[PDB]
């Protein structure tokens, strides 16, 4: 329960291309502008709003398939490529390094496991 803060970072036409490396992809600045100062009941609530805004940003939505845009439209994370999955974790996750968007990044489940396991 809190407000979203942060500026995020500029992104290109291949936003999630590096979600499987280092700390993943940053919250897009345009998305940060849409969520900044808004209040959220929970992280899950923040996450749904986040993906919904992504589906509304033409430059970001064009980077996903129709099936993935439908998922984001209702606030669910897009599915990752088969090779980036980890067991039952098959969609992008938000990693945290009250809701500071400059400390939130998009990562694949595989890369997320490694980050937390010291890799």
């Amino acid at each position: 329960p809190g407000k979203a803060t942060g500026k995020g970072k500029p992104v290109n036409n291949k936003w999630l291309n590096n979600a499987g490396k280092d700390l993943g992809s940053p919250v897009p600045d345009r998305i940060a502008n849409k969520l900044r100062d808004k209040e959220f009941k929970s992280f899950d609530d923040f996450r749904k709003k986040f993906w919904e805004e992504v589906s509304k940003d033409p430059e970001l939505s064009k980077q996903f398939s129709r099936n993935n845009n439908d998922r984001m439209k209702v606030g669910k994370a897009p599915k990752t490529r088969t090779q980036d999955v980890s067991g039952k974790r098959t969609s992008f996750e938000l990693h945290e390094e009250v809701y500071d968007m400059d400390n939130i990044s998009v990562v694949t489940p595989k890369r997320h496991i490694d980050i937390h396991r010291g890799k």
Binding site: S65, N67, K76, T90
Partner: protein, 87 residues
């Protein structure tokens, strides 16, 4: 709907219905049911990239139910596996 045990039990039209069922669950609040339908899809298609056919379609084909069936039909035929039911 009814989940058949193999592609040979599916007509192309019936496979498309399975794809629209998956599309409906994409917009459901959770992925509980979706994930079972996706596991079934992966299991019967036998394509190495599994769910990528749905969520990460190749640019050389259409991103639609018709394009997914077509890609599956060409891949199966090319690998000598049984195709969709002709009924």
């Amino acid at each position: 709907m009814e989940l058949k045990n193999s592609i040979s039990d599916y007509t192309e039209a019936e496979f498309v219905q399975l794809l629209k069922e998956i599309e409906k669950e994409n917009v459901a609040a959770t992925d509980d049911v979706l994930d079972v339908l996706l596991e079934h899809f992966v299991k019967i298609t036998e394509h190495p990239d599994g769910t990528d056919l749905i969520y990460y379609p190749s640019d050389n084909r259409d991103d639609s139910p018709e394009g997914i069936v077509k890609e599956i039909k060409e891949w199966r035929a090319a690998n000598g596996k049984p195709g969709f039911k002709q009924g």
